[PDB]
Amino acid sequence: SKTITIYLDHASLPTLNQLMHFTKESEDKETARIFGFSRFKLPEKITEQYNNIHFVEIKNNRPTEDIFTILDQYPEKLELDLHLNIAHSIQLFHPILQYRFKHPDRISIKSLNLYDDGTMEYVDLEKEENKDIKSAIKKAEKQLSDYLLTGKINFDNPTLARYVWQSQYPVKYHFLSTEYFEKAEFLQPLKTYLAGKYQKMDWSAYEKLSPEQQTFYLKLVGFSDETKQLFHTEQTKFIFTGTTTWEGNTDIREYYAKQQLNLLKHFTHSEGDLFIGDQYKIYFKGHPRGGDINDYILKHAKDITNIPANISFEILMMTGLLPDKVGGVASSLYFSLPKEKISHIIFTSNKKIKNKEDALNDPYVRVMLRLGMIDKSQIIFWDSLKQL
Numbered sequence: 001s002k003t004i005t006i007y008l009d010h011a012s013l014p015t016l017n018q019l020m021h022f023t024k025e026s027e028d029k030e031t032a033r034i035f036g037f038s039r040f041k042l043p044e045k046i047t048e049q050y051n052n053i054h055f056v057e058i059k060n061n062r063p064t065e066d067i068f069t070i071l072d073q074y075p076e077k078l079e080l081d082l083h084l085n086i087a088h089s090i091q092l093f094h095p096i097l098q099y100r101f102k103h104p105d106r107i108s109i110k111s112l113n114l115y116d117d118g119t120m121e122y123v124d125l126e127k128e129e130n131k132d133i134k135s136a137i138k139k140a141e142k143q144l145s146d147y148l149l150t151g152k153i154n155f156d157n158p159t160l161a162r163y164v165w166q167s168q169y170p171v172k173y174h175f176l177s178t179e180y181f182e183k184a185e186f187l188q189p190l191k192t193y194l195a196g197k198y199q200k201m202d203w204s205a206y207e208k209l210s211p212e213q214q215t216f217y218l219k220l221v222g223f224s225d226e227t228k229q230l231f232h233t234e235q236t237k238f239i240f241t242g243t244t245t246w247e248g249n250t251d252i253r254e255y256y257a258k259q260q261l262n263l264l265k266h267f268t269h270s271e272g273d274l275f276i277g278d279q280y281k282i283y284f285k286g287h288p289r290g291g292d293i294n295d296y297i298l299k300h301a302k303d304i305t306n307i308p309a310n311i312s313f314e315i316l317m318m319t320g321l322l323p324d325k326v327g328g329v330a331s332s333l334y335f336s337l338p339k340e341k342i343s344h345i346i347f348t349s350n351k352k353i354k355n356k357e358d359a360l361n362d363p364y365v366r367v368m369l370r371l372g373m374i375d376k377s378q379i380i381f382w383d384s385l386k387q388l
Helices: 013-024 066-071 089-102 120-126 133-150 178-183 185-193 211-221 225-229 253-268 292-300 313-318 332-336 356-360 363-370
Strands: 002-009 032-037 053-055 078-085 107-115 171-175 198-200 237-241 281-285 325-329 342-347 379-381
Touching (some): 002 013, 002 089, 089 133, 171 178, 178 198, 211 313, 237 253, 253 292, 253 342
Parallel strands (some): 002 032, 107 171, 171 198, 342 379
């Protein structure tokens, strides 16, 4: 045997969790690793410490066949420990399966760790709420078994098929919302089925790491000590969530920057409708693509600390640097937040959302409402707020 640890993700949240696993195993400089990521590349000062370390491209929802060339470097019996995105697990896994078929006596899958993409998994499960879940599970297991023996990808319920891997391999799942699985009545049979095999994504692991390992993790994810310092104060913290543009009857980007500055004022100025109080230090998390819009907001906002583009809410979560409060323009990140940290979420106009009613009907917002993460007084339509 050689064991090979293979980390696959085209998104960002599974990557960040997989890098935490790598960090926890980082003293082991021997085991072979394959990193198959879309959005993170590892610093050479880390990678030069590892003698058996490889990188593969993700293209479509799959590792390319360059992974065959990598695995061809290892002619011994191999036992593969796989780490995959839950929503895309079939597609990420398939090239590994094709490779096994080429060397069926020599290559086996040892274990699977599966991690949430994000809201996708929940939005998808919600579409299954009128099905018979118990029989959907037994079907999915038969089909998965065929898929493994032959390679053919046929699932009557692809969404539930994401969750039946334990019928074939040792598996662990890492979920953004364990409450969802435990409180949705229709999923009771899935909950029971998965018992013992899942955990909530641990935002606390960073704080439990040794200082050396914490330094390692920050270096892997590109969190400089400079930027980390912006969060070193005991003052409580509010982060405003920015956006780019929306359907506001003009194409002038500066209009949208001004309007966000007004939304921000509603949180930070004493006579705003959504005033948070003087207790919080104010941070701005602009959209990575805001460019000149973000320049504009930072030029005209007073006493505000910019969070750089490389630092996502996922990174904040994973490093235990979530702030006390988050508010501003709506996006799926709000789903990942504990309820006590959400102030108000402001929806802007697009083709789906034209008013506050449409906002309440958004797929991820519907779950949030049901799980009690927010109430309706927390959902605002951008139009309802006066200029200041």
